[PDB]
Amino acid sequence: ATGPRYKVPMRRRREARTDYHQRLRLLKSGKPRLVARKSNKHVRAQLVTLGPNGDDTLASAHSSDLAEYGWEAPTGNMPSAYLTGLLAGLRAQEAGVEEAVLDIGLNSPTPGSKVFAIQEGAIDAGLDIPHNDDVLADWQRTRGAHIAEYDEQLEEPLYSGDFDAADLPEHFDELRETLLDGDIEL
């Protein structure tokens, strides 16, 4: 910018998208990174391996294509997150991937957050990831109990388009259920 002596941060740092200091610590384990990233309406869960020209993605799982299996609900909540995790956890299981380290990116290590909830799904999928049980949310909030009991405070539908009025966290079970099925086209 100013002159020759000037120092311009690595691109991905200007952009403020990669925390290299943390990244390094991650990269050390040698295990693939279970990339967990949010979005206002969506939630992604990539499984990355290191490469000669840049990281490789051996298995992803987007909340969007979560409906591809029969999800008629929103795509930016705990039920959503968990599932997406378990989905990528499976696909990854189909690539020879057995263990990984949770890469929560620039997000925060908050207890019960969707990320940990994403991490919980990949674990359940069969993958081996260093975790901390009591940091994960309670099985219910993972289902959608926190949200269902919210629509109980109705008077106005929790949703716009009709998925249903009282909402069905059971659906969560229904979908999860459908994933443990051997057939299911991944």
Partner: peptide
Amino acid sequence: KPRDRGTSPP
């Protein structure tokens, strides 16, 4: 060298 200052790539 000046432009190689700060933390290095992982």
